[PDB]
Design a binder for this molecule. Structure first.
Ligand code: MG
Ligand code: MG
Ligand code: MG
Ligand code: MG
Ligand code: MG
Ligand code: MG
Ligand code: MG
Ligand code: MG
Ligand code: MG
Ligand code: MG
Ligand code: MG
Ligand code: MG
Ligand code: MG
Ligand code: MG
Ligand code: MG
Ligand code: MG
Ligand code: MG
Ligand code: MG
Ligand code: MG
Ligand code: MG
Ligand code: MG
Ligand code: MG
Ligand code: MG
Ligand code: MG
Ligand code: MG
Ligand code: MG
Ligand code: MG
Ligand code: MG
Ligand code: MG
Ligand code: MG
Ligand code: MG
Ligand code: MG
Ligand code: MG
Ligand code: MG
Ligand code: MG
Ligand code: MG
Ligand code: MG
Ligand code: MG
Ligand code: MG
Ligand code: MG
Ligand code: MG
Ligand code: MG
Ligand code: MG
Ligand code: MG
Ligand code: MG
Ligand code: MG
Ligand code: MG
Ligand code: MG
Ligand code: MG
Ligand code: MG
Ligand code: MG
Ligand code: MG
Ligand code: MG
Ligand code: MG
Ligand code: MG
Ligand code: MG
Ligand code: MG
Ligand code: MG
Ligand code: MG
Ligand code: MG
Ligand code: MG
Ligand code: MG
Ligand code: MG
Ligand code: MG
Ligand code: MG
Ligand code: MG
Ligand code: MG
Ligand code: MG
Ligand code: MG
Ligand code: MG
Ligand code: MG
Ligand code: MG
Ligand code: MG
Ligand code: MG
Ligand code: MG
Ligand code: MG
Ligand code: MG
Ligand code: MG
Ligand code: MG
Ligand code: MG
Ligand code: MG
Ligand code: MG
Ligand code: MG
Ligand code: MG
Ligand code: MG
Ligand code: MG
Ligand code: MG
Ligand code: MG
Ligand code: MG
Ligand code: MG
Ligand code: MG
Ligand code: MG
Ligand code: MG
Ligand code: MG
Ligand code: MG
Ligand code: MG
Ligand code: MG
Ligand code: MG
Ligand code: MG
Ligand code: MG
Ligand code: MG
Ligand code: MG
Ligand code: MG
Ligand code: MG
Ligand code: MG
Ligand code: MG
Ligand code: MG
Ligand code: MG
Ligand code: MG
Ligand code: MG
Ligand code: MG
Ligand code: MG
Ligand code: MG
Ligand code: MG
Ligand code: MG
Ligand code: MG
Ligand code: MG
Ligand code: MG
Ligand code: MG
Ligand code: MG
Ligand code: MG
Ligand code: MG
Ligand code: MG
Ligand code: MG
Ligand code: MG
Ligand code: MG
Ligand code: MG
Ligand code: MG
Ligand code: MG
Ligand code: MG
Ligand code: MG
Ligand code: MG
Ligand code: MG
Ligand code: MG
Ligand code: MG
Ligand code: MG
Ligand code: MG
Ligand code: MG
Ligand code: MG
Ligand code: MG
Ligand code: MG
Ligand code: MG
Ligand code: MG
Ligand code: MG
Ligand code: MG
Ligand code: MG
Ligand code: MG
Ligand code: MG
Ligand code: MG
Ligand code: MG
Ligand code: MG
Ligand code: MG
Ligand code: MG
Ligand code: MG
Ligand code: MG
Ligand code: MG
Ligand code: MG
Ligand code: MG
Ligand code: MG
Ligand code: MG
Ligand code: MG
Ligand code: MG
Ligand code: MG
Ligand code: MG
Ligand code: MG
Ligand code: MG
Ligand code: MG
Ligand code: MG
Ligand code: MG
Ligand code: MG
Ligand code: MG
Ligand code: MG
Ligand code: MG
Ligand code: MG
Ligand code: MG
Ligand code: MG
Ligand code: MG
Ligand code: MG
Ligand code: MG
Ligand code: MG
Ligand code: MG
Ligand code: MG
Ligand code: MG
Ligand code: MG
Ligand code: MG
Ligand code: MG
Ligand code: MG
Ligand code: MG
Ligand code: MG
Ligand code: MG
Ligand code: MG
Ligand code: MG
Ligand code: MG
Ligand code: MG
Ligand code: MG
Ligand code: MG
Ligand code: MG
Ligand code: MG
Ligand code: MG
Ligand code: MG
Ligand code: MG
Ligand code: MG
Ligand code: MG
Ligand code: MG
Ligand code: MG
Ligand code: MG
Ligand code: MG
Ligand code: MG
Ligand code: MG
Ligand code: MG
Ligand code: MG
Ligand code: MG
Ligand code: MG
Ligand code: MG
Ligand code: MG
Ligand code: MG
Ligand code: MG
Ligand code: MG
Ligand code: MG
Ligand code: MG
Ligand code: MG
Ligand code: MG
Ligand code: MG
Ligand code: MG
Ligand code: MG
Ligand code: MG
Ligand code: MG
Ligand code: MG
Ligand code: MG
Ligand code: MG
Ligand code: MG
Ligand code: MG
Ligand code: MG
Ligand code: MG
Ligand code: MG
Ligand code: MG
Ligand code: MG
Ligand code: MG
Ligand code: MG
Ligand code: ZN
Lengths: 131, 204, 118, 59, 5, 71, 122
RNA sequence: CGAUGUCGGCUCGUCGCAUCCUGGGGCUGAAGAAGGUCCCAAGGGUUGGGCUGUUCGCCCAUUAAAGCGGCACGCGAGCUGGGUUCAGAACGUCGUGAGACAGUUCGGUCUCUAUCCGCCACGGGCGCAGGAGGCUUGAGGGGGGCUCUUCCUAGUACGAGAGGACCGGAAGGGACGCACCUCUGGUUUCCCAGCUGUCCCUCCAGGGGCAUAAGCUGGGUAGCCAUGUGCGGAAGGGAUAACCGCUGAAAGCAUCUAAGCGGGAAGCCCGCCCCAAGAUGAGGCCUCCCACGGCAGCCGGUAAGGACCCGGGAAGACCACCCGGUGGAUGGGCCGGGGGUGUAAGCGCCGCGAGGCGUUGAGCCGACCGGUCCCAAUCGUCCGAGGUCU
RNA sequence: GAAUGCCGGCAUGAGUAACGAUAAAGAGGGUGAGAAUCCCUCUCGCCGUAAGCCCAAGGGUUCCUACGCAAUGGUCGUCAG
């Protein structure tokens, strides 16, 4: 038997492909299905991806945003069915895979360290030219 | 009572009604009936299941005879499921349906010689304030001249794990019969690749 | 516990263990066959096979990679020009450990030969 | 600690009962198929230098 | 060594 | 005495193995008012219990005399 | 994960600025408080002339934690501070404004006035 | 008195019951709710802080409750040493003085090696009348045993109101236990990268050592883990305690009792989980070998089998256990995937330059999931029945 | 037959603690009856206000060369104060 294969076979019915690739440093908008008392509504959470810990189906990414003077971080399963969509808001470029250090940086400092990833910005604009 | 032999494949989680559900996958079947214990012949009721086919070049003549009386290919494991008389000649994952509760029996992970802190969750000792070479020690093990001895069953360092453990009342989250797979919610004793036993729960 | 842990420790701290593997690599690659203790011989196969596989690649990058462990340009030159050609069609398994019959007298240690294969 | 110490001399009987586990097992030896000498299995013959049916070292 | 006083 | 609790315990200070092991100290508590008197003046719980009750009574009395005098 | 000695910011306008948890009001001996649990606390730091003053022993519900909160859907949420809203023994907030985001767990635990007052629920 | 180490704390508990809680009750000056009092009951539970060396006690905030005692006031060959309990010093006090103090004050050496019993783990031997490979019965042990809130019933019964049930039915907790690593969060001694100083290779470039037993720093797989996850306390059957009865004499009445029967506890037996046939009372079942040769014994060579040796293992201190040993995927290599790091070197281009851009998510790359006989588990050896009597 | 007697011998603890700084080793070649431990070469590591060098005190042949390995050397020894 191939145990890893079996596990992947169990997870295959739950894997998503509809979501855009992003990298730590990218500013992203996760549209998330939330229940509140009775109904379910879609709440937006937009922030800088500070982390993607990969484990195949079990990959999760962590998005950080300052919200009314308070920094909030929110961890999402990358293949959650609660995730309506993820919009790339902006392409930042980092020099490492985890950006925990931006938790102790000022606004202008984060602006300086994670700059516009011109290359992957142009790749984005060159795509969608698939008319 | 209904049972089946299995292999612990690994863990992961699925989503069910917008809930992430931790699961342990088990490769249960298929388990051919090799022997049936009956009140007349053996004094009790049980079914000896086989599991995992074996290299016939690795099965001695006593065991080959045991399989020949059954008409079964040589197999790696024989385990009885007590008080279980399956209808046919083969026991498969289909004996369980999603939503049933099961007890799973595995062989725990072996800690080897285990400290009193790991084995019994003792508090150990202080790490400063004068503590003298007793940070992970058990402390006193008794009284004085009365009784002048240590009780049997006293909690002490020693081997820990690699032991039969039965976790009970696990939700069967899914059955995938084409792959002989079983999904139980929660944790199951032992390593991946370890052999397990899945019986119908005794809770109610 | 040691569950699923790869790698002997050989009663050496981290920098001494790495230097041990490098020195045995320099000697194996130098003489083609060395005698050492059975546990050392077994751990060397992996360290040396990897170096010979990079030699089989032959690019400047592999040579620079191999030099980090071997340091000797003349030895690396022998690794690339004389040794790696012998293994061009061999899929790993460039080293062989056979065990000797007589234990070392001063400490009883079991010995083995390690050699490059034909 | 407070210096533990043997309470009684161990008797000849008790001392020698502790040693009932100390006898050496003789070395496992097989004949070399090349030169018929007794050597431990899975080692190169130290007498003729053969292993796996061929010469591996000089002796 | 502490004392029985 | 039914509204008086008497506590006995180890005293403080010198005494060696004596002070370590003897319930010579006494606390007497007037349960209605809550006021307490303590005594470890001697080595004897009995003498200390007596002196404690003496002082306790003398203090309650001075309270009762003070109320009637304010009245 | 709040416990006795833990300092919490006050996310309301009661006058209190820092409160120190002295008790987790969750049973006989709960070790930890998280979002939506009530605590008893000492008011360690306050602005002048507020409703509560330094020294007051108050109740509050924890609204934000630096230890992330796990949710049945597999997600989690984490805040930059540990914050609480000071309440009365009837669970109603004692201030009139709630500063900063609060955890959606407060809703499902019957702190609806607080959830209402909060500028964002996460 | 040729030494029985003395307070408190810590650790580890175990027992008693005169019971703090929880369960069951009778009486009540018991309307309800909440109490009081006594009876049964020791299964489980019995919080975190401030003060003080404290025990004790007070206080804060909670709790179902914050029980009381025994065990050399349990436990210093288990720890501590704040106190007590030597030698220094000082205050008060006493003494002419030297000195003295259940008076105070600051300080003041707590001993690596366990022989026997006991305890926790693990083997070796023999036994269990043939010799073997499996699978098991469970005598008898052990584990476990807590409890709260809210809601519905129902704002009903009860009560002037305030308040506010029984019974039954839901949901959610705290602490504890067992297991687990998918997620969360740790570690991850060399898996990747960045950085300084110095010395070296080989001058540039690119690298190596050392700065810890990782030089430092940012990260980090598997594993091992809790702060994370799953699950447990039962349900149910039986016999009881206090207590309440049915029928019922003695004793025309009465009586729970003398004959008989019922109900009745978190407790008792079983039930659940784990160990267990050295259970010498050594059990049961399925299967395999078989009357060998030589003077209830001996000795050889064998059978079924097993061991030795070897490659290993989420098994493990050794031992054991488990798997594999070329008819082989057991380890190592190699290969693919995962995963980590985060875009190698070299070259080209821009800049005076530090650098930047491109090639490029590149290069490197532990353990994870697989594949592949490239390397190594070569070749073998030794044990091992012939079955007592009735 | 006892004096924690005296002198000596031999047991037990026990194949147990330990083998004296955690600066660190690996291989190849030589010698020899015998080599982890001696010699040689290469690689590695450690000290470098020292763990290098020179005096004085003290020690008194421990210096050099050959030949040796019973004991001394905490193992071994072909080596050595
Ligand atoms: Mg997996
Ligand atoms: Mg910002
Ligand atoms: Mg920049
Ligand atoms: Mg770019
Ligand atoms: Mg198997
Ligand atoms: Mg298992
Ligand atoms: Mg585990
Ligand atoms: Mg311990
Ligand atoms: Mg623990
Ligand atoms: Mg444990
Ligand atoms: Mg502790
Ligand atoms: Mg503690
Ligand atoms: Mg601790
Ligand atoms: Mg420490
Ligand atoms: Mg000390
Ligand atoms: Mg100690
Ligand atoms: Mg220490
Ligand atoms: Mg101890
Ligand atoms: Mg004692
Ligand atoms: Mg004693
Ligand atoms: Mg006794
Ligand atoms: Mg195991
Ligand atoms: Mg074990
Ligand atoms: Mg268990
Ligand atoms: Mg359930
Ligand atoms: Mg499903
Ligand atoms: Mg399958
Ligand atoms: Mg099993
Ligand atoms: Mg361990
Ligand atoms: Mg360890
Ligand atoms: Mg491995
Ligand atoms: Mg390594
Ligand atoms: Mg060591
Ligand atoms: Mg070492
Ligand atoms: Mg060693
Ligand atoms: Mg180093
Ligand atoms: Mg060399
Ligand atoms: Mg060698
Ligand atoms: Mg060696
Ligand atoms: Mg080149
Ligand atoms: Mg490399
Ligand atoms: Mg060999
Ligand atoms: Mg050998
Ligand atoms: Mg030697
Ligand atoms: Mg030696
Ligand atoms: Mg000690
Ligand atoms: Mg001691
Ligand atoms: Mg000590
Ligand atoms: Mg000692
Ligand atoms: Mg004696
Ligand atoms: Mg002795
Ligand atoms: Mg004697
Ligand atoms: Mg004798
Ligand atoms: Mg003797
Ligand atoms: Mg003995
Ligand atoms: Mg003898
Ligand atoms: Mg022994
Ligand atoms: Mg022998
Ligand atoms: Mg009294
Ligand atoms: Mg006293
Ligand atoms: Mg005092
Ligand atoms: Mg005195
Ligand atoms: Mg006394
Ligand atoms: Mg006096
Ligand atoms: Mg104020
Ligand atoms: Mg103030
Ligand atoms: Mg003030
Ligand atoms: Mg407020
Ligand atoms: Mg704020
Ligand atoms: Mg005495
Ligand atoms: Mg004596
Ligand atoms: Mg004596
Ligand atoms: Mg003595
Ligand atoms: Mg007790
Ligand atoms: Mg009673
Ligand atoms: Mg009471
Ligand atoms: Mg009660
Ligand atoms: Mg009651
Ligand atoms: Mg009532
Ligand atoms: Mg009333
Ligand atoms: Mg009552
Ligand atoms: Mg009564
Ligand atoms: Mg009890
Ligand atoms: Mg304080
Ligand atoms: Mg205190
Ligand atoms: Mg106190
Ligand atoms: Mg006191
Ligand atoms: Mg109560
Ligand atoms: Mg109360
Ligand atoms: Mg208390
Ligand atoms: Mg005591
Ligand atoms: Mg006590
Ligand atoms: Mg004590
Ligand atoms: Mg001590
Ligand atoms: Mg003590
Ligand atoms: Mg003692
Ligand atoms: Mg003692
Ligand atoms: Mg002791
Ligand atoms: Mg003692
Ligand atoms: Mg002291
Ligand atoms: Mg002291
Ligand atoms: Mg003295
Ligand atoms: Mg004076
Ligand atoms: Mg006088
Ligand atoms: Mg005077
Ligand atoms: Mg006078
Ligand atoms: Mg005086
Ligand atoms: Mg004094
Ligand atoms: Mg006194
Ligand atoms: Mg004093
Ligand atoms: Mg003083
Ligand atoms: Mg003092
Ligand atoms: Mg001092
Ligand atoms: Mg010591
Ligand atoms: Mg012993
Ligand atoms: Mg004894
Ligand atoms: Mg014993
Ligand atoms: Mg045995
Ligand atoms: Mg028998
Ligand atoms: Mg027999
Ligand atoms: Mg058998
Ligand atoms: Mg059984
Ligand atoms: Mg039983
Ligand atoms: Mg018995
Ligand atoms: Mg119970
Ligand atoms: Mg109602
Ligand atoms: Mg009604
Ligand atoms: Mg009302
Ligand atoms: Mg109810
Ligand atoms: Mg318990
Ligand atoms: Mg556990
Ligand atoms: Mg685990
Ligand atoms: Mg994992
Ligand atoms: Mg993890
Ligand atoms: Mg993690
Ligand atoms: Mg990891
Ligand atoms: Mg590396
Ligand atoms: Mg480095
Ligand atoms: Mg450098
Ligand atoms: Mg350079
Ligand atoms: Mg260097
Ligand atoms: Mg250096
Ligand atoms: Mg160093
Ligand atoms: Mg440092
Ligand atoms: Mg690190
Ligand atoms: Mg980390
Ligand atoms: Mg990890
Ligand atoms: Mg892990
Ligand atoms: Mg674990
Ligand atoms: Mg936990
Ligand atoms: Mg639960
Ligand atoms: Mg009944
Ligand atoms: Mg009648
Ligand atoms: Mg009647
Ligand atoms: Mg009767
Ligand atoms: Mg009855
Ligand atoms: Mg009735
Ligand atoms: Mg019951
Ligand atoms: Mg219960
Ligand atoms: Mg069993
Ligand atoms: Mg058995
Ligand atoms: Mg018999
Ligand atoms: Mg018996
Ligand atoms: Mg038996
Ligand atoms: Mg049997
Ligand atoms: Mg039999
Ligand atoms: Mg039977
Ligand atoms: Mg065996
Ligand atoms: Mg092994
Ligand atoms: Mg293990
Ligand atoms: Mg073993
Ligand atoms: Mg051994
Ligand atoms: Mg071993
Ligand atoms: Mg063995
Ligand atoms: Mg087996
Ligand atoms: Mg085998
Ligand atoms: Mg073979
Ligand atoms: Mg074999
Ligand atoms: Mg393989
Ligand atoms: Mg492989
Ligand atoms: Mg296989
Ligand atoms: Mg290996
Ligand atoms: Mg990959
Ligand atoms: Mg990747
Ligand atoms: Mg670039
Ligand atoms: Mg490049
Ligand atoms: Mg470059
Ligand atoms: Mg470049
Ligand atoms: Mg230029
Ligand atoms: Mg840049
Ligand atoms: Mg990659
Ligand atoms: Mg590799
Ligand atoms: Mg790869
Ligand atoms: Mg590679
Ligand atoms: Mg895994
Ligand atoms: Mg193949
Ligand atoms: Mg042979
Ligand atoms: Mg004599
Ligand atoms: Mg005499
Ligand atoms: Mg004498
Ligand atoms: Mg003498
Ligand atoms: Mg003599
Ligand atoms: Mg003598
Ligand atoms: Mg003598
Ligand atoms: Mg002698
Ligand atoms: Mg001796
Ligand atoms: Mg001896
Ligand atoms: Mg030994
Ligand atoms: Mg010993
Ligand atoms: Mg030892
Ligand atoms: Mg020693
Ligand atoms: Mg020593
Ligand atoms: Mg040792
Ligand atoms: Mg040092
Ligand atoms: Mg040493
Ligand atoms: Mg050190
Ligand atoms: Mg050093
Ligand atoms: Mg070493
Ligand atoms: Mg070397
Ligand atoms: Mg060497
Ligand atoms: Mg050498
Ligand atoms: Mg050599
Ligand atoms: Mg030597
Ligand atoms: Mg020699
Ligand atoms: Mg050496
Ligand atoms: Mg030399
Ligand atoms: Mg210098
Ligand atoms: Mg001189
Ligand atoms: Mg001299
Ligand atoms: Mg001389
Ligand atoms: Mg000599
Ligand atoms: Mg010698
Ligand atoms: Mg000699
Ligand atoms: Mg001589
Ligand atoms: Mg010597
Ligand atoms: Mg010697
Ligand atoms: Mg020495
Ligand atoms: Mg010689
Ligand atoms: Mg000399
Ligand atoms: Zn031969």
């Amino acid at each position: 038997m191939n145990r890893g294969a079996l596990i992947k076979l169990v997870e295959s019915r739950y894997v998503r492909t509809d979501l855009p690739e992003f990298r730590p440093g990218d500013t992203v908008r996760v549209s998330y299905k939330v229940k509140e008392g009775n109904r379910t509504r879609i709440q937006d959470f937009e922030g800088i991806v500070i982390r993607i810990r990969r484990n195949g189906f079990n990959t999760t990414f962590t998005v950080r945003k300052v919200s009314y003077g308070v920094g909030v971080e929110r961890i999402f399963p990358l293949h959650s069915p609660l995730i309506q969509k993820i919009d790339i808001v902006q392409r930042g470029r980092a020099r490492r895979a985890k950006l925990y250090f931006i938790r102790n940086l000022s606004d202008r400092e984060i602006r300086r360290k994670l700059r516009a990833d011109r290359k992957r910005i142009d790749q984005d604009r060159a795509a969608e030219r698939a008319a | 009572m209904k049972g089946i032999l299995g292999v612990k494949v690994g863990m992961t989680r699925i989503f069910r009604d917008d809930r992430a559900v931790p699961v342990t996958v088990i490769l249960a079947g298929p388990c051919p009936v090799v022997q049936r214990r009956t009140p007349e012949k053996d004094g009790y009721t049980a079914v000896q299941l086989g599991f995992l086919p074996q290299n016939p070049k690795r099965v001695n003549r006593p065991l080959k005879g045991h399989f020949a009386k059954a008409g079964v290919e040589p197999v790696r494991i024989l385990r009885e499921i007590r008080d279980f008389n399956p209808e046919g000649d083969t026991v498969t994952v289909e004996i369980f349906k999603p939503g049933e509760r099961v007890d799973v029996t595995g062989t725990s992970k072996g800690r080897g010689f285990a400290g009193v802190m790991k084995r019994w969750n003792f508090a150990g000792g202080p790490d400063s304030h004068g503590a003298h070479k007793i940070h992970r020690h058990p402390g006193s093990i008794g009284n004085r001249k009365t009784p002048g001895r240590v009780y049997k069953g006293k909690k002490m360092a020693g081997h820990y794990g690699a032991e039969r453990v039965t976790v009970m009342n696990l939700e069967v989250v899914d059955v995938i019969p084409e792959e002989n797979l079983l999904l139980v919610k929660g944790a199951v004793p032992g390593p991946n690749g370890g052999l397990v036993i899945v019986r119908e729960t005794k809770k109610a | 516990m040691r569950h699923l842990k790869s790698g002997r420790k050989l009663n050496r701290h981290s920098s001494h263990r790495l230097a041990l593997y490098r020195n045995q690599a320099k000697s194996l690659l130098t003489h083609g066959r060395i005698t050492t203790t059975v546990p050392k011989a077994k751990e060397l196969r992996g360290f040396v096979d990897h170096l010979i596989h990079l030699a089989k690649r032959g690019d400047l990058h592999a040579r620079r990679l191999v030099l980090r462990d071997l340091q000797d340009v003349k030895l690396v030159r022998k690794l690339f020009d004389e040794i790696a050609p012998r293994y061009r069609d061999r899929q790993g398994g460039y080293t062989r450990v056979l065990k000797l019959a007589e234990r070392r007298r001063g400490d009883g240690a079991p010995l083995a030969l390690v050699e490059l294969v034909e | 600690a407070k210096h533990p110490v043997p309470k009684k001399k161990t008797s000849k009987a008790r001392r020698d009962a502790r040693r009932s586990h100390h006898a050496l097992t003789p070395p496992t030896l097989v004949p070399c198929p090349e030169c018929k000498a007794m050597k431990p299995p899975h080692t190169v013959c130290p007498e003729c230098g053969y292993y796996a049916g061929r010469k591996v070292l000089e002796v | 060594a502490a004392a029985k006083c | 005495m039914d509204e008086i609790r008497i506590d006995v315990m180890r005293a403080s200070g010198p005494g060696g193995d004596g002070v370590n092991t003897t319930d010579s100290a006494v606390r007497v508590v007037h349960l209605p008012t809550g006021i307490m008197v303590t005594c470890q003046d001697s080595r004897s719980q009995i003498k200390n219990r007596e002196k404690a009750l003496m002082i306790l009574r003398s203090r309650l009395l001075e309270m009762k005399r003070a109320e009637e005098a304010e009245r | 994960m709040i416990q006795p000695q833990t300092y919490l910011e006050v996310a309301d306008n009661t006058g209190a600025r820092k409160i120190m948890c002295i008790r987790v009001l969750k049973g006989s001996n709960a070790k930890y408080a998280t979002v939506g649990d009530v605590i008893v606390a000492s008011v360690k730091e306050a602005i002048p002339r507020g409703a509560v003053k330094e020294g007051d022993v108050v109740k509050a519900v924890v609204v934000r934690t630096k230890k992330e909160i796990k949710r049945p859907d597999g997600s989690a949420i984490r805040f930059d501070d540990n914050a609480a809203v000071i309440i009365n023994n009837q669970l109603e907030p004692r201030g009139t404004r709630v500063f900063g985001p609060v955890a959606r767990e407060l809703r499902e635990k019957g702190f609806m006035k607080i959830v209402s007052l909060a500028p964002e629920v996460l």
